[PDB]
Design a protein around this ligand. Structure first.
Ligand SMILES: *Cc1c(COP(=O)(O)O)cnc(C)c1O
Ligand SMILES: *Cc1c(COP(=O)(O)O)cnc(C)c1O
Lengths: 325, 325
């Protein structure tokens, strides 16, 4: 842990969910093929529930919830939401109650299934947007605080300002553990929250390292706008300045959730060549974006890929993947 | 890594699949309830594919396969086999070919689905026993060595002698990393291979620690007999002596694969109380056996539970679990 990032995060409360540093590995076969050195940081091994990036955010999001004495945590997402499941699981683990506000086919699979198995309260709506649901949560919240109860509402993907500190911390971890001079750090971009933290983090260490995001869905308008809005807000929390511009490419393949044979092909490749399991909605596309950029000599010689989890999506959208291979 | 276990394993070849020590955590809520300190070693985070215990065995099983120049690895199990999937994945990762000889409903779920997604060659038979298939593999093998090819056949659950060294090594890791004086180490028992390694390992360090196995299926006859046969064979490999008697209780709930509301209840409990996901076929029953023994004050004050993976079984047998909660 870098002394600087350590001192800057010192005054922030957090619940310690991750009790260790996730490992970083070199990918020999992938590296040989793309003509660049690619490493992977294993945040799919963060340990709570299905692991992944959202666990780092929850340490702060839940630290914040406990601080306000919340007794019920509410958040949203698609039915296949990784964020929703682990948010519910982590909240119950801390004696809190949770209500997941989802959207999508109510099939017993993936994280939705996991939600039911753990007995997490699930409320599915006809909505279309992930922020559309935000008002439905604000419904269950704004009211639930009538039965006395205090509610704590978390934005999509934990894209809150303190949530973002999760990856400021991750940068600190990576700085101290790795013995590699990285050229860029490639991460999938959903809410842009993880990317935001990595950006601010690198910025704080004044590292000439390119934080590269791979948008897996709706590129940007109010997205590319909240990204910057996310970066400056968390940077204000750290009472720090923000080095301008986190890169962002589009490999959503048209739309969030769209599953393609090229994404399916990357999942099988990385799986059988590095023994690592990626997912159809996030990491698979993100890594696809990695191989693409890399081969076009646009990411440098040493690339660190953040594995943000999502194995549930591979069980969930499994057959759509088969039917494409 | 204990110098002794280190020197004893020095002359054995292995492929390094796991690049780090899996963590050990204390379980506060579970510990409060059962009235004993229970810790968990995270071998569900071994990293390759779905992780788990079989990865430790494969480092030796595959080291052995490469040494004999094998070009095709063959093994067996039920369709939901964790061993079969990761064996196939690790073999392909090392440029080897694999043929999985399974048995069960050909439903696209769990590890079976994963098998197809990664494109691992799958051959399902009408057999009933896991050793019944052993002859069918020995069919595909004994013959496949006609098209020139050399085959390497792995026993059920990697229950081979060198495979067992995987957990002799694990004991070495645990000895050096933990700062806890354990009373017993509880692990699920399928082929008894993992238990065998832990036993021999503790025996080698002459630790007054009780290796406790939890049979999740057919207790023992030719099982309880191969266990001892496994322990002495691997101990002969290490040119060492064997301290007599690894404990073994039955919590199979009648039969291997049988899923019950008590096993389903433990999966939900440990999940919502420790944020850790267990599985219906192995760890859930094993941990059930933990809580039972513990409460009966029969495991001691400090208990180390080995998490051997299996998350796939929770996606696979998910609905059977719901319908029980
Ligand atoms: C939620 C998620 C992401 C995206 O995180 P953002 O902070 O929204 O960019 C990427 N990968 C996986 C597996 C996820 O679950
Ligand atoms: C295979 C397996 C076991 C049993 O291992 P043995 O070496 O056969 O005792 C236990 N738990 C899980 C999750 C497994 O996949």
């Amino acid at each position: 842990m870098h002394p600087k990032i350590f001192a800057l995060l010192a005054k922030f409360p957090r619940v310690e969910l991750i009790p260790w540093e996730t490992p970083i590995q070199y990918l020999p076969n992938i590296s040989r093929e793309i003509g660049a050195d690619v490493y992977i940081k294993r945040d799919d091994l963060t340990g709570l529930g299905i692991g992944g990036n959202k666990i780092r955010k929850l340490e702060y999001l839940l630290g914040d919830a406990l601080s306000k004495g919340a007794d019920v945590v509410i958040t949203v997402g698609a039915v296949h939401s990784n964020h929703a499941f682990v948010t519910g699981l982590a909240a119950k683990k801390l004696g809190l109650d949770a209500i997941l506000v989802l959207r999508g086919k109510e099939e017993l699979k993936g994280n939705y299934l996991l939600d039911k198995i753990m007995g997490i309260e699930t409320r599915v709506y006809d909505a279309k947007d992930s922020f559309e649901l935000m008002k439905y949560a604000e419904e269950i919240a704004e009211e639930l605080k009538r039965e006395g109860r205090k509610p704590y509402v978390i934005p999509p993907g934990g894209a809150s300002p303190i949530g973002t500190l999760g990856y400021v911390r991750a940068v600190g971890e990576i700085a101290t553990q790795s013995e590699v001079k990285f050229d860029s750090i490639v991460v999938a971009a959903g809410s842009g929250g993880t990317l935001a933290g990595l950006s601010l983090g690198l910025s704080i260490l004044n590292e000439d390292i390119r934080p590269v995001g791979i948008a897996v869905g709706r590129f940007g308008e109010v997205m590319t706008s909240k990204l910057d809005n996310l970066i400056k807000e968390a940077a204000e929390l750290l009472g720090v300045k923000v080095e301008v511009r986190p890169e962002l490419y589009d490999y959503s393949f048209g739309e969030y959730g769209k599953i393609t044979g090229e994404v399916a092909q990357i999942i099988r490749k990385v799986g059988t060549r590095e023994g690592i399991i990626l997912d159809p909605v996030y990491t698979g596309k993100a890594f696809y974006g990695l191989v693409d950029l890399a081969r076009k000599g646009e990411l440098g010689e040493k690339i660190l890929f953040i594995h943000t989890g999502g194995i549930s999506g591979t069980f969930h959208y499994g057959d759509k993947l088969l039917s494409l291979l």
